[PDB]
Amino acid sequence: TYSITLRVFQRNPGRGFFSIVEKTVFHYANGGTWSEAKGTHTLTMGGSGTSGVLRFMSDKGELITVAVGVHNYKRWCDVVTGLKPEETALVINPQYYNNGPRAYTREKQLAEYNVTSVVGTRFEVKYTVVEGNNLEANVIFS
Amino acid sequence: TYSITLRVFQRNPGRGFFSIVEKTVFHYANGGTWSEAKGTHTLTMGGSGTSGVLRFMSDKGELITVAVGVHNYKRWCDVVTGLKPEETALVINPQYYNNGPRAYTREKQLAEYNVTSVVGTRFEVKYTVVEGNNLEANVIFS
Amino acid sequence: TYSITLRVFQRNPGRGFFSIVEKTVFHYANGGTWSEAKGTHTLTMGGSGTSGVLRFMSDKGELITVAVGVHNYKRWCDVVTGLKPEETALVINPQYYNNGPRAYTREKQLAEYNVTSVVGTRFEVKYTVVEGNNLEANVIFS
Amino acid sequence: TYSITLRVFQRNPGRGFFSIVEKTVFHYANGGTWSEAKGTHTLTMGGSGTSGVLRFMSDKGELITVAVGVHNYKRWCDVVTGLKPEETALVINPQYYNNGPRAYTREKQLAEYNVTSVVGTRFEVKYTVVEGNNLEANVIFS
Ligand SMILES: CC(=O)N[C@@H]1[C@@H](O)[C@@H](O[C@@H]2O[C@H](CO)[C@@H](O)[C@H](O)[C@H]2NC(C)=O)[C@@H](CO)O[C@H]1O
Ligand SMILES: CC(=O)N[C@@H]1[C@@H](O)[C@H](O[C@@H]2O[C@H](CO)[C@@H](O)[C@H](O)[C@H]2NC(C)=O)[C@@H](CO)O[C@H]1O
Ligand SMILES: CC(=O)N[C@@H]1[C@@H](O)[C@H](O[C@@H]2O[C@H](CO)[C@@H](O)[C@H](O)[C@H]2NC(C)=O)[C@@H](CO)O[C@H]1O
Ligand SMILES: CC(=O)N[C@H]1[C@H](OC2[C@@H](CO)O[C@@H](O)[C@H](NC(C)=O)[C@H]2O)O[C@H](CO)[C@@H](O)[C@@H]1O
Structure with missing residues (x-):
């Protein structure tokens, strides 16, 4: 198991x-x-090769996703901002697989990643435990 | 809007x-x-014709999903039991659309539905408010 | 410690x-x-001889308290119903101590307790793990 | 009522x-x-003249309380840091009344308060809606 x-x-x-x-x-x-x-929030996975997505909405109406998972026994993460109402996590999560348009950032196996939405909201995923099967990360909004 | x-x-x-x-x-x-x-738990939708799914897991390990939404301005619901680990809600939710294998129960626009898992757990979704754009339902595990 | x-x-x-x-x-x-x-919900305590209270409110307006703790190394529990808005958990919890009006039910060291409110709501606290430092209980509203 | x-x-x-x-x-x-x-988190109160407390614990063991209420129709707030484990919110909340050691900061009817714990953690309560019966505050840990 990975968590x-x-x-x-x-x-x-x-x-x-x-x-x-x-x-x-x-x-x-x-x-x-x-x-x-x-x-x-803990995502527990049955093994290496999968992931989960959390979609956030601010009380100002901004929509963004945070994806975390394990690829080839190494943690990965991604943030997508400026989402439309119809671009739900259910749309976004699969785009990381089956040759989707997001699979490339998964393959990067990043232990850290940050991006700033066009509206000026900075997002960051930063693993504080980057090795092993019990991984830990901070999700930082700014 | 429908909630x-x-x-x-x-x-x-x-x-x-x-x-x-x-x-x-x-x-x-x-x-x-x-x-x-x-x-x-409130599912807020941008109109008629969509839905959301809650997947539950018991501390005994039983996996089931509750689907609720609005189809053609009428509420619908369904329950799927005996789920396998890989049958996440991300897998199940789309199965109600694009003429998927579950689209049939959605088209039923049920105001109530119950079913008992092969392991003997009864599940029921009963709408207490069946009309309008502010719907209310009780999810009953037994 | 006790939990x-x-x-x-x-x-x-x-x-x-x-x-x-x-x-x-x-x-x-x-x-x-x-x-x-x-x-x-887990209450973690630094030792035997203390307790904690959860106050609940129903969407019908009913107010009740659930008290759990450990007295002389044995679990105890109490339920108080028909509470007035001014009778907060902050008021109720201390009443089990210093010769308060509720101390007697703490001293009973009950592994189970049920009561039905005047308005007809049944409440039960039933310990499923009754001994040791890691106690478990079901809280049942009926 | 106030909230x-x-x-x-x-x-x-x-x-x-x-x-x-x-x-x-x-x-x-x-x-x-x-x-x-x-x-x-919303505290709803039956009128002016009361309050409630949130006690927080960091995963580093730090214990602090945040108090908010309304006194003589004006919002108030206070933060207490460096708490011992026996100094539960149940102990701290009443200390703002009956001429207790914290009544003085309630009387200040502050719309903003900040303080840094001896161990280096800054805490701030800042009301964003400072008037009326529907008050809003940001609680900021740094
Ligand atoms: C369907 C769509 O709009 N696709 C992208 C859009 O998501 C977008 O976002 C980036 O997506 C990559 C890969 O998932 C992220 O690493 C990155 O953080 C996103 N960029 C921002 C600013 O949020 C843009 C830019 O690649 O292109 C659209 O076509
Ligand atoms: C992949 C899979 O799960 N296949 C079948 C299951 O879908 C399945 O269940 C039934 O699905 C209906 C449509 O969603 C539900 O309305 C119904 O409640 C559900 N039945 C139960 C008992 O959960 C099972 C059992 O029919 O068969 C699988 O092959
Ligand atoms: C201030 C007040 O109303 N006091 C009494 C109530 O608390 C009360 O309740 C009973 O208190 C017992 C000791 O805590 C509980 O074990 C018992 O379950 C509870 N009874 C009910 C029906 O909830 C009433 C009635 O006994 O008397 C008041 O004077
Ligand atoms: C730094 C801090 O948290 N200040 C509090 C203030 O604190 C207390 C400490 C630190 O000054 O001093 C002790 O002597 C007090 N006694 C006990 C038993 O804790 C303790 O309250 O309390 C005031 C009033 O509540 C707050 O406004 C400060 O933020």
């Missing part, structure tokens, strides 16, 4: 306040599950 | 305790978002 | 739906903390 | 990650209730 535990840090009220609106899990490697404990 | 607010009732400790492990939203009708308030 | 993990089962929609509105921890035994994990 | 809705912003992963471990409501003004919606 990825996330801590959500939101740094700038000027960017509004984000909450989770969707949680998906891709079907590879026997799938997996999202759980909550002590204000954190 | 569906769910109250989860678990009646029989002998069946274990279920918790949400996934929450998807289908991309039709401008998509939508899940939110939580006062222990309830 | 008490609670699973909340709501059995009858006719009685309304309850959500937590308050969580207290008494200051004896070096205090303690409430946490949440996978839909369950 | 105070809180958005929690955690800015610095170096300070650890905080989660709620207790929520109390003082018994004045006919009491009140805590609720959760879309990742925010």
Whole structure:
């Protein structure tokens, strides 16, 4: 099994306040599950080769996704911003596989990644535990 | 807009305790978002013709999905039990669309539905508010 | 230390739906903390001789408290129903101590307790793990 | 009635990650209730003259309380850091009343308050809606 535990840090009220609106899990490697404990979010996966996505919406209406998973026994992550209402996590998650237009960032196996949406909201995924089967990452909104 | 607010009732400790492990939203009708308030779960949709799925897992390991949405301005629902690890909600949700294998129960626009898993766990989705754009349903595990 | 993990089962929609509105921890035994994990609630205490209270409110307006703790190395529990808005958990919890009017039920060290409110709501606390430092109980609204 | 809705912003992963471990409501003004919606926390009170406390614990062991209420029709707030484990919210909340050691900061009716714990963690409560019966504050950990 692989697990990825996330801590959500939101740094700038000027960017509004984000909450989770969707949680998906891709079907590879026997799938997996999202759980909550002590204000954190853990994706537990049946093996290497799958992932899950959390979609966030701010109280200002901004939509963004955070994808985390394990590819070839190494953690990966991605952030997609400027999403439209119809571009749900259910749309986004599969795009990382089957030669989708996002598979390339998965193959990068990034232990850290950041991007700034066009509206000026910075997002970052940063693994604090980058090795082994019990991975840990901070998700930082700013 | 169409919203569906769910109250989860678990009646029989002998069946274990279920918790949400996934929450998807289908991309039709401008998509939508899940939110939580006062222990309830609300699916807010940008119009008629879309849906979302909650996948539950018991602490005994039983996996089931609850689907709710609006089709042609009328609420619909379905429950799938005996799910395998790889049959995530991300897999199940799209199966109701594009003439998928589950599109038939959606077209039924059910205001109530119940079913019992082969392992003996009863599941019921009963709408308490069956009309309008602010729908209410009880999810009952037994 | 001692921990008490609670699973909340709501059995009858006719009685309304309850959500937590308050969580207290008494200051004896070096205090303690409430946490949440996978839909369950755990009270962690620094030792024997303290307790915690969860206050619930139904969407019908009913107010009740669930008290759990460890007295002389044995678990105890109590349920108070028909509470007035001013009778917060902060008021109720201390009443089990210092010769308060509720101390007697703490001293009973009950592994199980049920009561039915004047308005007809049944409540039960039933420990499933009754001994040791890691106690488990079901909380049943009916 | 009065309500105070809180958005929690955690800015610095170096300070650890905080989660709620207790929520109390003082018994004045006919009491009140805590609720959760879309990742925010709302304290609803039966009138002016009461309050409630949120105690947080970081995954680094830091214990702090945030107090918010309404005094003489004006919002107030306070933050206490460096708490011992026996100093539960149940102990701290009443200290703002009956001429307790914290009554003085309640009387200040502050719309903003910040303080840094001896161990280096900055805490701030800043109301964004400072007037009326529907108050809004950001709670910022740094
Ligand atoms: C369908 C669509 O709009 N595709 C992309 C759009 O998502 C977009 O976003 C980037 O997506 C990559 C790969 O998933 C991310 O690493 C990156 O963070 C996204 N960029 C931003 C600014 O959010 C753009 C740019 O590649 O191109 C559209 O076609
Ligand atoms: C891949 C798979 O799961 N195949 C079949 C299952 O879908 C399946 O269940 C039934 O699906 C209907 C349509 O979604 C539901 O309305 C119905 O409640 C559900 N039945 C149960 C008992 O869960 C099972 C059992 O029919 O067969 C599989 O082959
Ligand atoms: C201030 C007040 O109303 N006090 C009494 C109530 O608490 C009360 O309740 C009973 O308190 C017992 C001890 O805590 C509980 O074990 C018991 O379950 C509870 N009874 C019910 C029906 O909830 C009433 C009635 O006994 O008397 C009040 O004076
Ligand atoms: C730094 C801090 O948290 N200040 C609090 C203030 O704190 C207390 C500490 C630190 O000054 O001093 C102790 O003597 C006090 N006694 C006990 C038993 O804790 C303790 O309260 O309290 C005031 C009033 O609540 C707050 O406004 C400051 O933020």
